[PDB]
Design a protein around this ligand. Structure first.
Ligand SMILES: *[C@@H]1O[C@H](CO[C@@H]2O[C@@H](C)[C@@H](O)[C@@H](O)[C@@H]2O)[C@@H](O[C@@H]2O[C@H](CO)[C@@H](O[C@H]3O[C@H](CO[C@H]4O[C@H](CO)[C@@H](O)[C@H](O)[C@@H]4O)[C@@H](O)[C@H](O[C@H]4O[C@H](CO)[C@@H](O)[C@H](O)[C@@H]4O)[C@@H]3O)[C@H](O)[C@H]2NC(C)=O)[C@H](O)[C@H]1NC(C)=O
Ligand SMILES: *[C@@H]1O[C@H](CO[C@@H]2O[C@@H](C)[C@@H](O)[C@@H](O)[C@@H]2O)[C@@H](O[C@@H]2O[C@H](CO)[C@@H](O[C@H]3O[C@H](CO[C@H]4O[C@H](CO)[C@@H](O)[C@H](O)[C@@H]4O)[C@@H](O)[C@H](O[C@H]4O[C@H](CO)[C@@H](O)[C@H](O)[C@@H]4O)[C@@H]3O)[C@H](O)[C@H]2NC(C)=O)[C@H](O)[C@H]1NC(C)=O
Ligand SMILES: *[C@@H]1O[C@H](CO[C@@H]2O[C@@H](C)[C@@H](O)[C@@H](O)[C@@H]2O)[C@@H](O[C@@H]2O[C@H](CO)[C@@H](O[C@H]3O[C@H](CO[C@H]4O[C@H](CO)[C@@H](O)[C@H](O)[C@@H]4O)[C@@H](O)[C@H](O[C@H]4O[C@H](CO)[C@@H](O)[C@H](O)[C@@H]4O)[C@@H]3O)[C@H](O)[C@H]2NC(C)=O)[C@H](O)[C@H]1NC(C)=O
Ligand code: HEM
Ligand code: HEM
Ligand code: HEM
Ligand code: HEM
Ligand code: HEM
Ligand code: HEM
Ligand code: HEM
Ligand code: HEM
Ligand code: HEM
Ligand SMILES: [Mg+2]
Ligand SMILES: [Mg+2]
Ligand SMILES: [Mg+2]
Ligand SMILES: [Mg+2]
Lengths: 150, 144, 146, 147, 146, 147, 147, 146, 144
């Protein structure tokens, strides 16, 4: 019916996220982040060339780990901010400008990474709900892909 | 005191409690910054882009959200030196051009400590571990 | 595989896990949520039942039909003639769909995780693996279930 | 279909004589009693069941038939308070019947009388009104499109 | 199998089911009550820890060492060098007893029924089959768990 | 060993830093700290750990050793309120140590002081009294029979 | 329209600034703000309010108009969890607008942006997401049929 | 009548009885169940909103508009210019239907029984009779409510 | 920021919560003045008649009771300009001869804000609305 990320979907996404997120160590975050990227790079050959600065071709590099940690931190802040849309919108604008002025990064890549997350999550999260997860992920990306090319 | 292996495990767990999953993050971040600008109002001039004049705004709250995310990332890496430094280096870049005094870093350091202690209670707050490990983190942010 | 006794137990454990009222729908939604989490690729085989929306009246009807199938098959576990006739009937409905038999292996995993997770610790995985095989073998005819 | 209070009553009396804990033997016992009855009321409908070997109601082919029929009625009843799903469930059953030539709507009305005649003998304090109120709409949805 | 994502899934599901305090003992007793129900002949292999009486302190001590071993091994799932060294240590303790490898398969079934029975419907049976094979492989060195 | 209330405290404080949800990584960080410390207090015992490659405390073999030791300590602690099973668990542990020629009872005392020194740096509101009450009994029972 | 949880939030936030205990005075202060704002975004719509004396937004006639509009919005919001009645309530509202020649669908979008701009200044912890989820559906249904 | 103090009393008692959320719908349904019980012939006047079935969405929409009108009108009790302009607006909607004025008297009785029945013993019947007359007067322009 | 119509409705409601019916008034007023005299002890000399030396006394509590009553009256009139000014003029008289600096008015302004925020929570406190409308109120008190 409606593709809107509802209040109930937000609670569900946070649950799916919590019962998979490590409060104290990054071992669990890295694994999930890297897994997603490996999946994106294998579905979008070109994409890898956008992470040259963080050593995209060296998934286990010290600097790509740092990047994955930042990606996951950013997604963590957003998912938690689903409970306070006002601030979320601000946070999502700041993420937008961070992804703008970087040729290649388009709404196409985000649709690809969404698919990557949809494949990685069920393997790591228990009771994963793809539909609820999907609606709020998109809600999140739409604020990040504001000023981007298709 | 030194930010040793043990102190690092301590800080990690205490931080996990204080920071938590997400429901208490807004208040945690508020408490911290209300303390910063109270003790050092002059610091506000540096946050004109994110409404440093009013920390009740969504714009600043988003900022406070990024800062905490910054600490979370570092604390989460206090046991992975190699990756911790790469990260501390990134944060260093994000600040390198803003002219942050060693005094302000200390103020934000104390804000954060009072905030965590306020979050988990004076009863368990490990002052030494926190002071030694936060300075390790600030040092990284300032190049060194 | 699946001797008279194993059948008596799987019938017992299934009834308990299956339950009454809405508890059946819940059991069914869990089963399919797991089937699709185990193998996301299997979801597209069900476009004919709006699998893209699991809360849709069409997909819920499918859920009900399937667990209704498992329930009648399991109930007839102690009567070969009746049982094998229904397995043939079910085979007859699935064959024209040319499904990869490996999907029936995933289905079984999900069924065990769902009945097991509902029944609790005294779940008899060995018994269920042996008997589910009889079922899969009957529906697919694939000797991979021998 | 029928009200929440009516359906709840029906769903309860049904679960009384049908549930996962009820052996297949007692199912086809109800299965044969119903179909024997249907046939007496409408002798001409019996041949419609030649594929399931109606010739021998004690046969596996026929046993498996009445078992899947009762299973179908069971889903119907249990989904009485989930209109959306029931509409989809009955629309499926309908199609499955419209495909069989020779099936008349009257035969479904007959099955209704059989259920209203046979059930009381099996259920405790059978409520004929709540059942009539829930069975009719159900039977009509499954007999939609039949001549 | 047992890729990194499955190891994480397994560490998480295990932590929840194993629990704390005396809940570990309960889980421990369920695991073994299943192992012996699935293979009554395996009980005689444990006379050295008075398996003839599962409530005896001798057998409860054994139950504790075995589940403590599952825990430490699962906790190392993310570090090969540490994991393998410890699996070899366990292999060194099981080898001299000339144990039939089929019992490790029984163990696995019992463990799945117990973790899932305790964890609930979201139990990931496939992930556990894959990763348990890895554990069994290390302890028996037998390619049966390939 | 020690009282239900005393044990309750120990078990609770221990679970705070050790449990199934605690990555093995931090488990060997505590392990290296513990054994590094034992070595400074009793240098002559380091040799005893040659088969687990104590020459390289970052080796898979030694990491596994400490994981294994903390795991035993975990079992002892979690069984404090089961005097029978713990007597058994400790007798077994004792056998595993006596066999190691060179193991002096006094080395176990040193470990005792190391734990009492390190745990407070790790645990919130560490209770040295409740731990001493419970640890000492465990310690005496595990080192029972050592020269 | 929108979910029970989403509506719950909207209804609750709305009642915070609008309810039977809120004097009509503040009701037209919000009304004037809303319409003044609509006019700045779409000056060509101001003419549409001539029969309610929009030339003098302090006139009894216009004050009554806004009171009447906020009252409709109130009905829509308070009926979000009654999909049937709201479909009816919105069809009626729709009829009352289509009749007004000159009313462009786009004018309703502008109102949408005005509400989303003004409400946050009025409501505590305004939830733009829950409102968008509920308002948009209402908006589309009320402007359904406008050119 | 309906002096300023009575208007305030009325605004207060109304707010309490009308309530929030679905409580308004309950009040709404009680008001109308009384109107039709008091004058069964008035029901036929509402075929345009399917009064033949009061649970129908058509009639519930009507119930909502009518009580929403009572609310907005009562909320304006303290501002003549706004009040009268809105009463004239309502008069403009009721006039073309050539409604017998006696029904407005029935309405008033039903409203009092409903507000008081919900508000409790402190219901100020006199204040409500006075102020309702003012509302009725504006909608019908009939001096019957003088 | 401007104390517009919307900001005024906001302040009114937030104030209603913070001020309340009567049970929490003593504590609300205490919190406010403990903050005033802490930040500006020199201000006490002006309240020698109502025991400004000890705000725990009934005499001062009565004073604190009148001040809050003053704000309540103004906030309650933020939508009736004509009457608001007449009132602000009265309060202006009651102070006109006491030599209240613009700095003190700002201090009491902040005391009141922290007090309301402490009363309704940082989570909902509308900083801009409150700052703009309280200054409108102080301005009136100081003639202008
Ligand atoms: C309707 O079906 C039922 C059930 O049969 C099923 O459905 C059919 C449609 C078929 O598809 C069947 O394949 C399916 O099972 C029919 O009732 C059954 O009929 C069978 C006969 O087929 C009855 O069993 C008789 O046969 C057994 C076994 O016979 C074999 O073994 C003996 C050695 O012991 C050999 O000598 C035979 O050559 C053969 O290989 C036999 O033990 C029984 O006979 C015993 O009892 C007699 C006394 O009454 C003694 O005189 C004998 O010596 C012997 O001890 C059976 O006669 C089976 O009982 C029934 N089942 C029931 C519950 O009635 C049904 O007939 C059919 N209806 C019609 C008319 O079409
Ligand atoms: C105690 O053990 C630790 C951990 O090692 C583990 O434990 C041992 C007991 C054994 O069980 C090991 O199997 C187990 O891993 C020791 O530290 C580790 O040691 C390794 C190396 O000693 C560290 O990794 C570095 O080593 C590679 C070696 O590759 C070289 O040699 C081959 C042929 O022999 C050549 O073909 C290669 O081209 C290469 O020359 C080294 O290449 C790595 O460096 C890469 O990355 C650089 C990027 O900055 C590049 O510039 C290089 O070209 C190259 O590609 C690594 O530096 C491993 O990280 C550590 N572990 C950690 C995290 O410390 C420890 O040394 C031992 N104690 C002692 C003193 O023996
Ligand atoms: C938009 O409407 C508003 C509100 O008015 C309402 O809405 C209209 C659309 C109509 O429906 C009106 O019926 C309805 O009230 C307009 O503002 C109001 O306007 C009136 C006057 O325009 C304000 O009140 C003042 O008016 C009286 C008028 O009396 C004079 O005229 C008669 C004969 O024609 C003489 O016999 C009188 O002696 C007198 O000269 C005025 O006297 C009042 O002033 C009194 O008080 C002063 C004390 O300071 C004395 O010095 C004076 O001598 C006198 O006794 C009032 O000033 C009324 O307050 C406003 N409402 C508000 C609060 O603003 C608005 O103007 C209109 N828009 C436009 C531009 O037309
Ligand atoms: C919704 C999921 C995503 C999240 C949460 C996310 C988050 C982040 C974060 C936090 C940064 C670092 C910003 C900084 O500190 O400067 C970042 C950088 C970046 N992201 Fe994303 N991102 C997402 C998806 C994507 C996608 C789909 C693409 C591309 C197709 C992309 C491309 C990039 C690039 C090129 C950078 C800059 C990396 C660098 O050089 O440091 N991101 N992202
Ligand atoms: C406690 C350690 C600190 C951490 C972890 C930290 C982290 C961060 C992060 C993550 C950002 C956002 C960067 C971006 O995405 O653009 C940031 C921005 C900023 N930080 Fe810090 N910070 C710390 C201390 C400080 C201190 C002590 C000051 C100075 C008083 C400061 C001043 C700023 C400023 C002015 C910005 C830019 C905000 C903007 O306009 O976007 N930070 N900090
Ligand atoms: C052994 C377990 C299974 C049982 C008991 C079962 C049972 C059923 C039943 C009763 C139907 C409805 C038949 C009808 O009335 O038309 C059905 C339909 C279907 N099944 Fe299964 N099934 C099983 C496994 C599977 C598997 C593993 C797949 C493949 C991935 C599958 C794919 C389908 C499809 C595509 C349909 C048709 C849905 C439609 O009507 O559009 N089934 N199954
Ligand atoms: C309302 C009660 C009834 C229910 C719930 C019902 C249910 C079912 C079901 C579930 C099937 C099997 C579909 C499949 O999986 O292939 C079926 C088949 C059939 N039904 Fe019904 N049915 C009902 C009444 C009737 C009536 C009154 C007649 C008419 C004489 C009838 C004639 C048939 C026929 C001819 C078949 C095909 C049998 C075969 O496979 O050879 N049904 N019915
Ligand atoms: C992968 C699962 C298994 C794990 C983690 C495991 C772990 C352990 C551990 C930790 C011990 C005690 C070692 C010591 O302290 O000396 C042990 C002992 C033993 N295990 Fe296992 N074990 C497993 C499977 C099995 C299986 C399948 C059998 C065979 C039937 C078995 C038979 C034994 C025996 C006979 C002992 C010695 C008991 C004694 O002390 O007398 N184990 N096992
Ligand atoms: C009181 C705390 C202690 C606990 C809980 C403990 C526990 C353990 C455990 C579980 C093992 C492995 C048993 C196996 O599975 O083979 C072990 C081995 C060993 N322990 Fe301890 N231990 C403690 C103190 C000590 C002390 C104080 C020494 C002496 C310096 C010591 C020396 C050893 C040695 C030499 C081994 C054998 C290592 C090898 O396999 O090469 N332990 N201990
Ligand atoms: C979505 C929010 C809106 C709501 C809830 C709303 C509600 C109402 C209501 C209740 C009436 C009075 C009906 C009656 O009793 O006669 C009304 C009238 C009217 N509305 Fe709206 N309205 C909305 C948006 C708009 C917009 C965007 C326009 C266009 C510019 C508009 C133009 C009008 C006009 C021209 C009238 C008739 C005024 C008259 O009587 O002269 N409305 N509206
Ligand atoms: C003072 C009390 C009354 C109030 C506040 C009131 C209010 C309303 C309102 C707001 C409407 C809907 C206007 C629209 O949106 O088009 C309405 C419609 C109507 N009212 Fe009343 N009314 C009252 C008394 C009555 C009485 C006593 C009768 C007569 C029996 C009556 C008969 C009607 C009819 C026939 C409609 C039109 C229904 C339709 O849309 O088909 N009203 N009233
Ligand atoms: C926030 C705005 C303020 C309000 C609403 C306010 C209100 C009042 C009121 C109602 C009185 C009692 C007058 C009487 O009945 O005699 C009063 C007295 C007084 N106010 Fe304020 N005041 C405010 C700010 C201040 C400030 C900033 C100062 C200076 C530091 C101040 C100093 C005094 C003094 C000295 C008195 C006389 C007390 C006495 O001895 O009776 N006020 N104020
Ligand atoms: Mg410092
Ligand atoms: Mg060998
Ligand atoms: Mg006329
Ligand atoms: Mg000021």
């Amino acid at each position: 019916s409606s593709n809107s990320c509802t209040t109930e979907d937000r609670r569900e996404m946070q649950l799916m996220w919590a019962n998979v997120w490590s409060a104290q160590f990054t071992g669990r975050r890295l694994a999930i982040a890297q897994a997603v990227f490996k999946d994106l790079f294998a579905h979008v050959p070109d994409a890898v060339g956008l992470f040259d600065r963080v050593h995209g071709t060296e998934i286990d590099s010290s600097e790509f780990k740092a990047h994955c940690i930042r990606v996951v931190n950013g997604l963590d802040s957003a998912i938690g901010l689903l409970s306070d849309p006002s601030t979320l919108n601000e946070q999502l604008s700041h993420l937008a400008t961070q992804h703008q002025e970087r040729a290649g990064v388009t709404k196409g890549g985000f649709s690809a990474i969404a698919q990557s997350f949809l494949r990685v999550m069920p393997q790591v999260a228990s009771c994963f709900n793809p539909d609820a997860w999907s609606r709020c992920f998109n809600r999140i990306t739409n604020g990040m892909t504001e000023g981007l090319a298709e | 005191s030194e930010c040793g292996p043990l102190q690092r495990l301590k800080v990690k767990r205490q931080w996990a409690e204080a920071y938590g999953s997400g429901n208490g993050r807004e208040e945690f971040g508020h408490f911290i910054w209300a303390n910063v600008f109270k003790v050092a109002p002059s610091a506000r001039d540096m946050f004109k882009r994110v409404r440093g004049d009013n920390i009740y705004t969504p714009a600043f709250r988003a900022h406070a959200t990024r800062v905490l995310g910054g600490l979370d990332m570092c604390v989460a890496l206090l046991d992975d030196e190699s990756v911790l430094n790469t990260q501390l280096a990134h944060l260093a870049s994000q600040h390198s051009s803003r002219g942050v005094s060693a005094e302000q870093y200390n103020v934000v350091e104390h804000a954060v400590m009072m905030g965590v202690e306020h979050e988990i209670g004076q009863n368990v707050f490990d002052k030494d571990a926190w002071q030694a490990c936060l300075d390790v983190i600030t040092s990284g942010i300032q190049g060194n | 595989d699946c001797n008279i006794l194993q059948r008596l137990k799987v019938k017992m454990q299934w009834a308990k896990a299956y339950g009454f009222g809405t508890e059946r729908a819940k059991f069914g939604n869990s089963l399919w949520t797991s089937i699709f989490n185990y193998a996301p690729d299997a979801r597209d085989l069900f476009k004919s039942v709006k699998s893209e929306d699991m809360r849709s009246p069409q997909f819920k009807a499918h859920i009900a039909r399937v667990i209704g199938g498992l329930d009648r098959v399991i109930s007839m576990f102690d009567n070969e003639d009746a049982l094998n006739a229904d397995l043939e009937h079910l085979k007859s409905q699935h064959d024209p769909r040319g499904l990869d038999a490996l999907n029936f292996v995933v289905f079984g995993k999900a069924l065990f995780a769902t009945v097991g997770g509902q029944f609790g610790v005294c779940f008899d995985l060995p018994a269920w693996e042996s008997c589910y095989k009889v079922i899969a073998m009957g529906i697919t005819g694939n000797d991979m279930f021998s | 279909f029928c009200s929440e209070a009516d359906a709840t009553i029906v769903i309860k009396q049904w679960n009384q004589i049908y549930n996962a804990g009820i052996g297949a033997k007692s199912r086809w016992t109800m299965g044969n009693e119903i179909f024997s009855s249907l046939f007496k009321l409408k002798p001409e409908s019996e041949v419609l069941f030649n594929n399931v070997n109606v010739a021998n109601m004690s046969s596996g082919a026929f046993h498996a038939h009445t078992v899947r029929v009762l299973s179908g009625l069971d889903m119907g009843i249990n989904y009485l308070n989930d209109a959306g799903t029931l509409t989809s469930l009955t629309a499926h059953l309908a199609a499955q019947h419209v495909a069989r030539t020779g099936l008349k709507a009257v035969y479904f009305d007959a099955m209704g009388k059989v259920l209203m005649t046979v059930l009381p003998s099996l259920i405790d304090n059978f409520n004929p009104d709540a059942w009539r109120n829930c069975l009719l709409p159900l039977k009509n949805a499954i007999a939609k499109g039949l001549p």
